Amino acid sequence: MAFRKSNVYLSLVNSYIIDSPQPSSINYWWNMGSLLGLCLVIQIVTGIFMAMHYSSNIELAFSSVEHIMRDVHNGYILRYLHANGASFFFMVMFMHMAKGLYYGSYRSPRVTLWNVGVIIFILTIATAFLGYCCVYGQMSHWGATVITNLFSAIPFVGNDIVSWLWGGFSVSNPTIQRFFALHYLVPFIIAAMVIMHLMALHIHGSSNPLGITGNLDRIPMHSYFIFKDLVTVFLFMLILALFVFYSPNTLGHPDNYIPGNPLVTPASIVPEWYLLPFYAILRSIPDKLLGVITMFAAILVLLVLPFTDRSVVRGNTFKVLSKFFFFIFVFNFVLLGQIGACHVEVPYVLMGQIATFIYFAYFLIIVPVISTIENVLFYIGRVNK
């Protein structure tokens, strides 16, 4: 046999990359997983090369990030690459999750794959939060203050958990150094979780946009999907190069270039844009305990979706009502993000509460009823009786 099959490690690279049998009919939405791996390699490399210059003290965090932006050779390249690549990481992650929600990639074989994906989603949200708080701008300090003061709503040990996370009595020097140690650590937990994602993917193979079995027509991944993924790799690099070199501060809030002042509230405390729908699901509930419970349930309601998708065909490729309500869910998510960017004002509170209810009624109410109705319509449209 070949050396790519007989070796210990090259058999792994072969059975994952070179001979991995993909179905022939998958499209460019299946490129987002390889794109997320590319985003992770970009984030980890630019993160190490800025951690060689960053200082995590509360007097030197913002000054060291500005030292990267001014004194370090091509350090502006590394900083804008890290920041806008985190925004692109979350763009491609939302596309990966939405194509999973659409094409039914969460169903019966791949429930382990979907759940490990949700764990990666939680860890990546946490990494982005800690790294945003590492800059120690104005949005960093106050975002840290709000999101870690959320945990003082737990009635038993809320103050204990809060003063353990802070390392003191407010967000300060031990908080920022804690967050830097954790922001270095947690992406390697993400890399191990990506290897577990690849295991759960490899035991059953990819899905295809038809939803039907893909065992009949398959293609080895090398020389077909390598270049088919190279197309989107260069396209992702092109859009990221545009957003790094020509509009580098479009996806950033301009208040982060104010140094972190604990005595000044910046009149709109808002996190990064990819956490804004969860910030809106937070602020919709008029209680601090039920709000953070609803935000964690907003991340964790995707675990209910394998057992509520009552359909008998996989994926909304051939389902009219499921397609319509899937894009209603997608634009509800965009509305939720734009709502959470807004202030807490009169039409926005009711619109955010209604959009949160539609977000939770998609998985819990809309999907079982619509899929049952489509099962009945699919039966009686072709059974003659």
Partner: protein
């Protein structure tokens, strides 16, 4: 996840009622025409996800000519959607051609598995 016996029960109730038939059957016919699986050469029982032991049982119990024809329709739909086209209009599956061929095998394997579970969980009346 929804059992095929339940879909058959609800659909037979809709079809046996004269009001529900004339109200919901054209909605389902237009739903199937909008669903567009016939433009790829698929009948509907090619679309059922087979990765469960009831469907593996029914596909094992399918006769061989239906198995070879289903294999060709699945491979043809994969190649058609690879090329990002549809089949030509004489290669579309006609309405009278879209017969449930896997459905008696699915319903029989479902009744066998439900009877096996019910006998696994009996309580003898003593």
């Amino acid at each position: 996840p929804q059992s095929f016996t339940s879909i058959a029960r609800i659909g037979d109730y809709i079809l046996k009622s004269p009001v529900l038939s004339k109200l919901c059957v054209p909605v389902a016919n237009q739903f199937i025409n909008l669903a567009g699986y016939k433009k790829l050469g698929l009948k509907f029982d090619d679309l059922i996800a087979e990765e469960n032991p009831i469907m593996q049982t029914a596909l094992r119990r399918l006769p061989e000519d239906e198995s070879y024809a289903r294999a060709y329709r699945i491979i043809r739909a994969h190649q058609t959607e690879l090329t990002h086209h549809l089949l030509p209009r004489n290669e579309w599956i006609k309405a009278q051609e879209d017969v449930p061929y896997l459905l008696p095998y699915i319903l029989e394997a479902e009744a066998a598995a439900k009877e096996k579970d019910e006998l696994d969980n009996i309580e003898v009346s003593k």
